[PDB]
Design a protein around this ligand. Sequence first.
Ligand code: HEM
Ligand code: HEM
Lengths: 106, 106
Amino acid sequence: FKAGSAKKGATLFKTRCLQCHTVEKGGPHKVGPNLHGIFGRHSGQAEGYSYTDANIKKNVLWDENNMSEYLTNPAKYIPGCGMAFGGLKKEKDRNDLITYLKKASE
Amino acid sequence: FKAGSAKKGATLFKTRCLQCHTVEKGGPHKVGPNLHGIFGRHSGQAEGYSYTDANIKKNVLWDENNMSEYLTNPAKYIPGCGMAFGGLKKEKDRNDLITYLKKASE
Ligand code: HEM
Ligand code: HEM
């Protein structure tokens, strides 16, 4: 991962993630967990959310690379429902998004 | 609605709701919101969850009848994903479940 446009990323997040995730500090959980402070913890540790994916529950240390990989698969399992579009297949895309998430999640 | 078996209801909840909802006091949010104290508020007011369905967001006063109706439709929209099995089509079923939810949500 190499920094990109936080500005493009912000639009990515609003159009592809924000329907399931907030990022503001102390923001509420929705279908997915609030993501504030995501790059200072492991996976599966948002306060007041309880997780389903076995790998997220092993508590991976979130960094840029790990996250880029995580978001690479266009589909994602939404418990009890099925597969949803939760990924950016394009590299450039993730670099933009992750650049925004770093900032806005802090 | 007429009280039924909280015992049957408990099994219903564990097998059909618990994958998306907890009910214990102070229990965490998941795909759906924690439901503790559900019959003492309106819809769309769980602390630390942010909702999507326009009708839930109008804040309906949850009672037995309203809830039975709510759970009557076998399918339910899970934001960003699609339709999921979130209902009990059978009357007897809901009466069992709602009887348990009254107790366990308190
Ligand atoms: C590109 C857009 C998105 C990004 C970058 C993103 C990011 C993340 C991250 C980082 C996690 C792990 C959080 C943690 O470990 O605490 C997560 C989990 C989750 N996301 Fe997303 N997400 C996106 C889109 C979506 C969408 C559209 C949905 C729902 C339709 C969603 C639902 C979920 C759920 C349910 C979990 C928890 C999974 C589980 O418990 O098994 N995400 N997401
Ligand atoms: C019979 C089983 C279930 C019962 C009785 C039930 C009950 C409820 C109730 C009472 C609400 C409104 C909560 C409130 O107003 O605060 C709710 C909302 C919700 N439920 Fe369930 N539920 C069940 C199954 C499921 C399943 C299986 C899922 C996920 C696949 C789920 C996901 C949701 C979501 C996402 C919301 C919020 C909807 C929105 O924000 O638009 N439920 N449920």
